[PDB]
Amino acid sequence: DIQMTQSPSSLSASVGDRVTITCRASQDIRSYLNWHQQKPGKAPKLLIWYTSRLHSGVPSRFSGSGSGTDYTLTISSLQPEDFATYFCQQGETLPWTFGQGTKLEIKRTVAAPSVFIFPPSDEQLKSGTASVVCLLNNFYPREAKVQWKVDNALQSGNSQESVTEQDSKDSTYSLSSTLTLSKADYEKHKVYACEVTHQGLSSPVTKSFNR
Amino acid sequence: DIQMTQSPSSLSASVGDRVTITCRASQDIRSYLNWHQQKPGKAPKLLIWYTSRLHSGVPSRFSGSGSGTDYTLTISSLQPEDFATYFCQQGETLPWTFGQGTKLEIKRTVAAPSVFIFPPSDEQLKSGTASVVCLLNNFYPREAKVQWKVDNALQSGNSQESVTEQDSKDSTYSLSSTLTLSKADYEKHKVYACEVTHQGLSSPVTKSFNR
Amino acid sequence: QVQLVQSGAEVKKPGDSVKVSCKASGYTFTTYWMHWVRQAPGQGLEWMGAIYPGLSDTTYNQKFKGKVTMTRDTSTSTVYMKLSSLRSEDTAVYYCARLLDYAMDYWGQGTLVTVSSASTKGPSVFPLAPSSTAALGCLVKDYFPEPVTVSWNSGALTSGVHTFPAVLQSSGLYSLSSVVTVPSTYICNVNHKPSNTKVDKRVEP
Amino acid sequence: QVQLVQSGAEVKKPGDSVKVSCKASGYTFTTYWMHWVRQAPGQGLEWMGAIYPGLSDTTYNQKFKGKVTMTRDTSTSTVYMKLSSLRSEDTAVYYCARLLDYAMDYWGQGTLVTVSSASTKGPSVFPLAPSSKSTSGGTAALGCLVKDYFPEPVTVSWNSGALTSGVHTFPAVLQSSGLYSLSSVVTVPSSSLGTQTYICNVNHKPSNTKVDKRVEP
Amino acid sequence: PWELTILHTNDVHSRLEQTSEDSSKCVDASRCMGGVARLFTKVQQIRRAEPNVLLLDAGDQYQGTIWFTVYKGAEVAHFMNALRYDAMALGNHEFDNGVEGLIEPLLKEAKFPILSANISASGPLASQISGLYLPYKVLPVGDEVVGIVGYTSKETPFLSNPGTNLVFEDEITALQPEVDKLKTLNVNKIIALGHSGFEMDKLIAQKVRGVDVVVGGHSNTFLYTGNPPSKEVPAGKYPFIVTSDDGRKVPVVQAYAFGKYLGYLKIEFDERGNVISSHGNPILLDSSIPEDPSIKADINKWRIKLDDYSTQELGKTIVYLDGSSQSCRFRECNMGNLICDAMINNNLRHADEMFWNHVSMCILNGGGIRSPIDERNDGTITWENLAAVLPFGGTFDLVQLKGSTLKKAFEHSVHRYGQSTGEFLQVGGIHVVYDLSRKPGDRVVKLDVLCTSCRVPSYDPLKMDEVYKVILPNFLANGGDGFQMIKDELLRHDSGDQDINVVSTYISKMKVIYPAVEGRIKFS
Amino acid sequence: PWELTILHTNDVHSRLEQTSEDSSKCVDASRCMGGVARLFTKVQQIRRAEPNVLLLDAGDQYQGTIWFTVYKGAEVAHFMNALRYDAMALGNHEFDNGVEGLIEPLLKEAKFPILSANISASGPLASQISGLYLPYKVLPVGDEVVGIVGYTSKETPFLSNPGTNLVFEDEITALQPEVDKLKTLNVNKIIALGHSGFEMDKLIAQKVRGVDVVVGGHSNTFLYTGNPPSKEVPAGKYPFIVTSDDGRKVPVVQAYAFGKYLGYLKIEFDERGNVISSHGNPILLDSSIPEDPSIKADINKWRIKLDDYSTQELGKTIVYLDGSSQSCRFRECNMGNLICDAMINNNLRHADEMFWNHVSMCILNGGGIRSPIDERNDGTITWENLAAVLPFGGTFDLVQLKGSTLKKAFEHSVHRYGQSTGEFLQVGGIHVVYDLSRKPGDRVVKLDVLCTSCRVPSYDPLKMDEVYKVILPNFLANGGDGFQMIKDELLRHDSGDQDINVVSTYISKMKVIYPAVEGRIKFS
Ligand SMILES: [Mg+2]
Ligand SMILES: [Mg+2]
Ligand SMILES: [Zn+2]
Ligand SMILES: [Zn+2]
Ligand SMILES: [Zn+2]
Ligand SMILES: [Zn+2]
**Nearest chain E alpha carbon to A53:** E131
Instruction: State the DSSP string of E189-218.
Output: -EEEEEES-HHHHHHHHHHSTT--EEE--S
Q: What is the CATH number of the domain that holds C186?
A: 2.60.40.10
**Torsions phi, psi of E477, nearest 5?**
-55, -30
Residue E377: partners with Cβ closer than 8 Å, 6 or more residues away? none
**Cβ F340 vs Cβ F450: under 8 Å:** no
Residue C85: partners with Cβ closer than 8 Å, 6 or more residues away? C15, C17, C67
Going along chain D, which residue ranges are E strands? 3-6, 10-12, 18-25, 33-40, 44-52, 57-60, 68-73, 78-83, 92-99, 104-107, 111-115, 124-128, 140-149, 155-158, 167-169, 173-174, 180-188, 198-204, 209-215
Tell me how far CA of residue F145 lies from CA of A102, B73, B144, D27, F51, in angstroms: 77, 31, 55, 12, 14
Write down which residue in C115, C144, C169 finishes a domain: C115
Asked if F127's CB is within 8 angstroms of B31's CB, the reply is no
On whether both E177 and E236 belong to a single domain, the answer is yes
Question: Residue A44, preceding bond cis, omega within 30 degrees?
Answer: no
Residue E171: partners with Cβ closer than 8 Å, 6 or more residues away? E118, E151, E154, E194, E196, E200, E203, E204
On whether both F289 and F328 belong to a single domain, the answer is no
Pairing of strands E361-365, E467-473: parallel
**Torsions phi, psi of F205, nearest 5?**
-60, -40
- Could you give the residue ranges of the DSSP H alpha helices within F171-226? 171-184, 198-207
Q: Does the domain made of A4-106 have the CATH classification 3.30.565.10?
A: no
Pairing of strands A206-210, D3-6: unpaired
Q: Of the candidates D8, D3, D15, D205, which has an alpha carbon nearest to the alpha carbon of residue D94?
A: D8
Q: For residues B21 and B9, what is the distance between their CA atoms, to the nearest angstrom?
A: 9
Q: What is the CATH number of the domain that holds F232?
A: 3.60.21.10
- The method recorded for this entry reads X-ray
Q: Is the dihedral of CA F195, F199, F205, F207 positive or negative?
A: negative
Other CB atoms within 10 A of residue B201 CB:
14
Instruction: State the DSSP string of F75-107.
Output: HHHHHHHHTT-SEEE--GGGGTTTTHHHIIIII
**Cβ D140 vs Cβ D134: under 8 Å:** yes
Residue F484: partners with Cβ closer than 8 Å, 6 or more residues away? none
Tell me how far CA of residue F109 lies from CA of D97, F106, F268, F449, in angstroms: 29, 5, 34, 45
Write down which residue in E273, E304, E335 finishes a domain: E304
Q: For residues E340 and A173, what is the distance between their CA atoms, to the nearest angstrom?
A: 74
Q: For residues E422 and E415, what is the distance between their CA atoms, to the nearest angstrom?
A: 12
Q: Is E63 left (phi over 0), alpha (psi -120 to 50) or beta?
A: left
Q: Is the dihedral of CA E65, E71, E72, E73 positive or negative?
A: negative
On whether both F401 and F453 belong to a single domain, the answer is yes
∠ CA F361-F363-F369, rounded to 5°: 140
Q: For residues D154 and F101, what is the distance between their CA atoms, to the nearest angstrom?
A: 60
On whether both E334 and E282 belong to a single domain, the answer is no
Q: Of the candidates A59, A47, A117, which has an alpha carbon nearest to the alpha carbon of residue A86?
A: A47
Residue C101: its chain E contacts at CB < 8 A? 136-138, 185
Other CB atoms within 10 A of residue A47 CB:
23
**Cβ F138 vs Cβ F145: under 8 Å:** yes
Residue C10: burial class (beta carbons within 10 Å; 0-12, 13-18, 19+): middle
Largest CA distance in chain F: 78
Other CB atoms within 10 A of residue E29 CB:
9
Q: For residues F156 and F168, what is the distance between their CA atoms, to the nearest angstrom?
A: 8
Nearest to C107 among A44, A127, A133 (CB): A44
- Examine domains A4-106 and A114-210 and report if their fold is the same: yes
**Cβ F131 vs Cβ B51: under 8 Å:** yes
**Cβ D184 vs Cβ D169: under 8 Å:** yes
Other CB atoms within 10 A of residue E37 CB:
26
Q: For residues E2 and E320, what is the distance between their CA atoms, to the nearest angstrom?
A: 67
Residue E486 parent element (H or E): helix E484-489
∠ CA D89-D92-D98, rounded to 5°: 130
Write down which residue in E304, E319, E335 finishes a domain: E304
Pairing of strands E144-152, E190-195: parallel
Q: For residues F108 and F102, what is the distance between their CA atoms, to the nearest angstrom?
A: 8
How far the first Cα of chain E sits from its last, in Å, is: 76
Tallying the residues shown for chain F, one arrives at 524
Other CB atoms within 10 A of residue A10 CB:
13
**Cβ E102 vs Cβ E68: under 8 Å:** no
Residue F331, SS3? coil
Q: For residues B64 and B46, what is the distance between their CA atoms, to the nearest angstrom?
A: 12
On whether both C180 and C107 belong to a single domain, the answer is no
The upper half-sphere exposure of residue F305, i.e. CA atoms within 13 Å in the direction of its Cβ, equals 12
The gap from C-alpha F107 to its chain's centroid, in whole angstroms, comes to: 20
On whether both E241 and E334 belong to a single domain, the answer is no
∠ CA E257-E260-E263, rounded to 5°: 75
How far the first Cα of chain A sits from its last, in Å, is: 55
**Cβ B159 vs Cβ B178: under 8 Å:** yes
DSSP state of F291: P
On whether both D8 and D88 belong to a single domain, the answer is yes
On whether both C53 and C86 belong to a single domain, the answer is yes
The gap from C-alpha A137 to its chain's centroid, in whole angstroms, comes to: 16
Q: Does the domain made of A114-210 have the CATH classification 3.30.450.30?
A: no
On whether both C47 and C147 belong to a single domain, the answer is no
On whether both D19 and D73 belong to a single domain, the answer is yes
Q: What is the CATH number of the domain that holds E420?
A: 3.90.780.10
Residue E62's domain spans which residues?
A: 2-304
Asked if A133's CB is within 8 angstroms of C177's CB, the reply is yes
Among E118, E127, E138, most A C-beta atoms within 10 A, so best to mutate, is E127
Q: For the stretch F177-199, what's the b/e string if a residue is b when 16 or more beta carbons lie within 10 angstroms of its beta carbon? A: ebbebbeebbbbbbbbbbbbbbe
Write down which residue in D89, D115, D141 finishes a domain: D115
The gap from C-alpha A192 to its chain's centroid, in whole angstroms, comes to: 28
Residue D210: partners with Cβ closer than 8 Å, 6 or more residues away? D201, D202, D203, D204
Q: Of the candidates E410, E353, E362, E400, which has an alpha carbon nearest to the alpha carbon of residue E506?
A: E362
Q: For residues B124 and E377, what is the distance between their CA atoms, to the nearest angstrom?
A: 84
∠ CA A177-A178-A180, rounded to 5°: 145
Residue A49 pairs with which residues in a beta bridge? A53
Residue C77: its chain E contacts at CB < 8 A? none
Neighbours of chain A (3+ CB pairs under 8 A): C, E
**Cβ F430 vs Cβ F520: under 8 Å:** yes
Q: Which ligand is nearest to the CA of F213?
A: 2
Asked if F144's CB is within 8 angstroms of D33's CB, the reply is no
The gap from C-alpha F153 to its chain's centroid, in whole angstroms, comes to: 12
Q: For residues D134 and D141, what is the distance between their CA atoms, to the nearest angstrom?
A: 9
Residue E518: partners with Cβ closer than 8 Å, 6 or more residues away? E332, E337, F459, F518
Q: Side chain identity at F267, as an amino acid letter? A: I
**Cβ A159 vs Cβ A145: under 8 Å:** no
Instruction: State the DSSP string of E248-260.
Output: -EEEEE-B-STTS
∠ CA E453-E458-E464, rounded to 5°: 70
Q: For residues F98 and F40, what is the distance between their CA atoms, to the nearest angstrom?
A: 30
Asked if A114's CB is within 8 angstroms of C135's CB, the reply is yes
Asked if D55's CB is within 8 angstroms of F137's CB, the reply is no
**Nearest chain F alpha carbon to B48:** F131
Q: Is F280 left (phi over 0), alpha (psi -120 to 50) or beta?
A: left
Q: How far is the CA of E95 from the centre of ligand 4 (A)?
A: 11
> CA torsion, points E398, E400, E405, E411, in degrees to nearest 10?
30
On whether both E161 and E289 belong to a single domain, the answer is yes
Residue A209: its chain C contacts at CB < 8 A? 131
The gap from C-alpha F122 to its chain's centroid, in whole angstroms, comes to: 26
Total number of domains constituting chain E: 2
Q: Of the candidates B181, B196, B180, B191, which has an alpha carbon nearest to the alpha carbon of residue B135?
A: B196
The gap from C-alpha A91 to its chain's centroid, in whole angstroms, comes to: 27
Among E161, E324, E505, E514, most F C-beta atoms within 10 A, so best to mutate, is E514
Q: Is the dihedral of CA D134, D137, D140, D141 positive or negative?
A: negative
Q: For residues A137 and E196, what is the distance between their CA atoms, to the nearest angstrom?
A: 69
Q: For residues F44 and E249, what is the distance between their CA atoms, to the nearest angstrom?
A: 97
Q: How far is the CA of E93 from the centre of ligand 4 (A)?
A: 6
Instruction: State the DSSP string of E50-95.
Output: -SSEEEEE-S--SSSSHHHHHHTTHHHHHHHHHTT-SEEE--GGGG
Q: Side chain identity at F37, as an amino acid letter? A: A
Q: For residues E276 and E426, what is the distance between their CA atoms, to the nearest angstrom?
A: 56
On whether both F294 and F376 belong to a single domain, the answer is no
Total number of domains constituting chain D: 2
**Torsions phi, psi of A34, nearest 5?**
-120, 135
Q: Is E60 left (phi over 0), alpha (psi -120 to 50) or beta?
A: left
Residue F301: partners with Cβ closer than 8 Å, 6 or more residues away? none
The C-alpha of E319 sits at a distance from chain F's nearest C-alpha, in angstroms, of 5
Tell me how far CA of residue A97 lies from CA of A15, A100, A193, D164, E186, in angstroms: 31, 10, 44, 85, 22
Instruction: State the DSSP string of F332-370.
Output: --HHHHHHHHHHHHHT-----TT-S-S--EEEEEGGG--
Asked if E143's CB is within 8 angstroms of C100's CB, the reply is no
DSSP state of C97: E
Tell me how far CA of residue A111 lies from CA of A170, E123, F372, in angstroms: 10, 46, 65
**Torsions phi, psi of E491, nearest 5?**
-90, -25
Going along F189-260, which residue ranges are E strands? 190-195, 213-215, 240-243, 249-253
**Cβ E241 vs Cβ E249: under 8 Å:** yes
Q: For residues F263 and F85, what is the distance between their CA atoms, to the nearest angstrom?
A: 13
Q: What is the CA radius of gyration of chain E?
A: 24
Neighbours of chain E (3+ CB pairs under 8 A): A, C, F
Instruction: State the DSSP string of E285-299.
Output: --TTSPPPHHHHHHH
Q: Is the dihedral of CA F449, F451, F452, F457 positive or negative?
A: negative
Pairing of strands A102-106, A10-13: parallel
**Cβ C17 vs Cβ C82: under 8 Å:** yes
Tallying the residues shown for chain C, one arrives at 205
**Cβ A121 vs Cβ A175: under 8 Å:** no
Resolution of the experimental structure, in angstroms: 2.7
Instruction: State the DSSP string of D170-208.
Output: PPPEE-TTS-EEEEEEEEE-HHHHTTS-EEEEEEETTTT
On whether both E86 and E222 belong to a single domain, the answer is yes
Q: Of the candidates F314, F308, F310, which has an alpha carbon nearest to the alpha carbon of residue F513?
A: F314
Residue F137: its chain D contacts at CB < 8 A? 101
Q: Of the candidates F220, F193, F157, which has an alpha carbon nearest to the alpha carbon of residue F11?
A: F220
Kindly list the residues of chain E whose beta carbon comes within 8 Å of any beta carbon in chain C. 136-138, 140, 142-145, 185-186
Tell me how far CA of residue E358 lies from CA of D41, E400, F289, in angstroms: 85, 11, 61
Residue C179's domain spans which residues?
A: 124-203
Q: How far is the CA of F138 from the centre of ligand 5 (A)?
A: 25
Q: What is the CA radius of gyration of chain A?
A: 22
Question: Residue E239, preceding bond cis, omega within 30 degrees?
Answer: yes
Q: For residues B147 and B206, what is the distance between their CA atoms, to the nearest angstrom?
A: 9
Q: For residues A175 and A162, what is the distance between their CA atoms, to the nearest angstrom?
A: 6
Other CB atoms within 10 A of residue A110 CB:
11
**Cβ F88 vs Cβ F224: under 8 Å:** no
Q: Where are the domains of chain B?
A: 4-106, 114-210
Q: For residues E261 and E252, what is the distance between their CA atoms, to the nearest angstrom?
A: 16
Residue E376: its chain F contacts at CB < 8 A? 353
Q: At what angle do helices E36-49 and E74-82 cross, to 10 degrees?
A: 30
How far the first Cα of chain C sits from its last, in Å, is: 57
**Cβ A9 vs Cβ A24: under 8 Å:** no
The gap from C-alpha E405 to its chain's centroid, in whole angstroms, comes to: 24
Other CB atoms within 10 A of residue E271 CB:
9
On whether both F185 and F262 belong to a single domain, the answer is yes
Adjacency order of strands within the sheet including E380-382 = E380-382, E313-317, E512-513
On whether both D50 and D131 belong to a single domain, the answer is no
Q: Of the candidates C104, C53, C51, which has an alpha carbon nearest to the alpha carbon of residue C77?
A: C53
